[PDB]
Amino acid sequence: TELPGRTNAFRIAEVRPQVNGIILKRLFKEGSDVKAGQQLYQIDPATYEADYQSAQANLASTQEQAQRYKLLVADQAVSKQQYADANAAYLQSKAAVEQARINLRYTKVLSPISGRIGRSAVTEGALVTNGQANAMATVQQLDPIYVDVTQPSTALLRLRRELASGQLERAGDNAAKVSLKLEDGSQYPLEGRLEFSEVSVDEGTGSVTIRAVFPNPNNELLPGMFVHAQL
Amino acid sequence: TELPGRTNAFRIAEVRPQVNGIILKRLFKEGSDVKAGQQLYQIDPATYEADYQSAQANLASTQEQAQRYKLLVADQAVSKQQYADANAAYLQSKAAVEQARINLRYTKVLSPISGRIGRSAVTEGALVTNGQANAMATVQQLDPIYVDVTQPSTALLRLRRELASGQLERAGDNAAKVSLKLEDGSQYPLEGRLEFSEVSVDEGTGSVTIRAVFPNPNNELLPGMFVHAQL
Amino acid sequence: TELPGRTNAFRIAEVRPQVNGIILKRLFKEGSDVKAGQQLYQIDPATYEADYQSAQANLASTQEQAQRYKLLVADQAVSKQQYADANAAYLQSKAAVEQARINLRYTKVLSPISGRIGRSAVTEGALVTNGQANAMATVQQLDPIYVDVTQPSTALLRLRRELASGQLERAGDNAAKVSLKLEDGSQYPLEGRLEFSEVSVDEGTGSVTIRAVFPNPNNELLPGMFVHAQL
Amino acid sequence: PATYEADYQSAQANLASTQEQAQRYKLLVADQAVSKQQYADANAAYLQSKAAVEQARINLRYTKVLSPISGR
Ligand SMILES: O=C[C@H](O)CO
Numbered sequence A, B, C: 001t002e003l004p005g006r007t008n009a010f011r012i013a014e015v016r017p018q019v020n021g022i023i024l025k026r027l028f029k030e031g032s033d034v035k036a037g038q039q040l041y042q043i044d045p046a047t048y049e050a051d052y053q054s055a056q057a058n059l060a061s062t063q064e065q066a067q068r069y070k071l072l073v074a075d076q077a078v079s080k081q082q083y084a085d086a087n088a089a090y091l092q093s094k095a096a097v098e099q100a101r102i103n104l105r106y107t108k109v110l111s112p113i114s115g116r117i118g119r120s121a122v123t124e125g126a127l128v129t130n131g132q133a134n135a136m137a138t139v140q141q142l143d144p145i146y147v148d149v150t151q152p153s154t155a156l157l158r159l160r161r162e163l164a165s166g167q168l169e170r171a172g173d174n175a176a177k178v179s180l181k182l183e184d185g186s187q188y189p190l191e192g193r194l195e196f197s198e199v200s201v202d203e204g205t206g207s208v209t210i211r212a213v214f215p216n217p218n219n220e221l222l223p224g225m226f227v228h229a230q231l
Numbered sequence D: 001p002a003t004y005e006a007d008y009q010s011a012q013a014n015l016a017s018t019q020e021q022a023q024r025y026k027l028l029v030a031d032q033a034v035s036k037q038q039y040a041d042a043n044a045a046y047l048q049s050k051a052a053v054e055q056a057r058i059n060l061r062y063t064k065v066l067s068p069i070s071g072r
């Protein structure tokens, strides 16, 4: 039985800035392969770095001030109102520092997912804003790759039985082994699982949509291909 | 007697953001079974978390300030026009904190219902906005599953009698036991209740719509199937 | 004398939101019986509740400020302008609080009438807007139930006489006792009034439409049934 | 032609505007001051205007229905 379907990325992510600034450098090759956590951009941190240290300097100061006044109050050598204020400043500083630290950190735009980055919608030297509508770039995990198959609700059950009645070659719980046949006609060398758990149902058609998962190193398979799963 | 009908989810909910931000992680398998209250997404909280603590710091401060002026007014050491401004700030802080707390909490996009989530209409790293038109995802309770049956108003009464005149196998108050027959032809193994209380009436047809309730573990039954209840 | 007619709800009401937000919970069973004033939905109030208290805090503050300046102005200790601005703020806050309170109240979507709610056109987690076109649900009082009867203007007088000339069994002022006969053929066990005051007239036909009122506990009778009143 | 003439000038006013807008961005994109996305939008409008004006001009011209052939 041949099931028609479309190939889709296994996982997709968007790269976006979360701090305001100028793109200093774009550390990745358009179209290359990147790893989740890998620095993809560098926003000029000259300032954030400066504010962050400017801050810590402050905290170090107010903190000393506080820790000391608390000693004085204990001898009644300073009104508790003086202390309260001292500790007040200390807490604000401590807050400032944390926010500074957070912003500096957001300075190195990292990749959320592991996959294939494409073109960089943002040029070096460009101005980038936190919250900005457009994404700097998009990564896609193309290795294990999906094949969305759509069968009428009935057939999905028919197959589900055969899977349980051993009439279908097991591949795992709720999964039967399957082969792929490109619209080319050719036979994709490798083979993969065909999970039976439903992903979506067009109630207007009643038809269900399940996913097949094929290994795709070499990146032979790409999203959008009209293929055929085989059982 | 065989009553035609369609299978429908037992309950449906939508997943939506209620805070602005970037989708950090999508904690769920498209097509899986999720529980109500289960975290479905994580919106980056670096800041909301910072603000929230920045606030609490403040409240901790003003609160002390206030409480002290409260005891001080008695000795007339602190006026009443002070303990007023003081208590003013205290109340504002307390409010800021609650608002901070609320936003942080929305940072974890939980699932409203227990059911089956399908595809995630939002990619990781994407930008999400409170009030946004589109829903991030949709959960559907499919275990007990409904079967909407439509009979002409007359028939509904005829059956209602037999139910009371013992001529129909009781299943509970106003419910008669029923079996399901898929459009496949097969006989759904389990059987369930056919509640007689009306759910809706197409006055333009006069016909009524009642619901059958079948157990559906194993998830064999899906919404949209054209079935037949049997009595 | 058998008068043909259609059964109709005794009263209809629509459930709609009057505040913006997300449907947290839908507290009612589709197809059940609900009482006027009963909470049907809960719109996530996390924020409205927060704004309301955020407001009250503010009012508490400005109000003190005002009452104090009202003092200083009366002692030429401060200009009338200062007292003016202070009172200005006070008045704004007081307005803010009232609006907050109103919105919070709308957070609980109560049922306007007592009757029978059907399906909920809105899912939990859904986005709901004040002013939105569609109604979240519809309650229909079905106990006393109407039976719209249509007779030629002439016949309505004929009967009206007999009613006054004792030739018809009184049921109340302008009402004659009547029995119902379902299109089933059967005899509805209970009986009710047949009010003679006209409700509408198809001037294009000259025919009048009057209503019969039958008790309908057990909910045996439903809107849309083609029946027959008997005199 | 009262209107065609009005639309035509209504248009030309527009183009004169958007054209200035564009020519100005044309330089800020070179000095990475304006996002290549924006300059795109500016030049987009400019091209639309220029298109509108041509159509306006064409219609105004037709305000004078001429004879295709020489004859009777
Ligand atoms: O983001 C992937 C491609 O480069 C563009 O659209």
Ligand SMILES: O=C[C@H](O)CO
Pocket (backbone or CB within 6 Å): A199, A200, A201, B117, B118, B119, B120, B137, B138
């Ligand atoms: O929402 C259900 C499916 O995942 C999509 O369309």
Ligand SMILES: O=C[C@H](O)CO
Pocket (backbone or CB within 6 Å): B199, B200, B201, C031, C117, C118, C119, C120, C137, C138
């Ligand atoms: O709203 C009345 C019925 O429940 C549905 O359509």
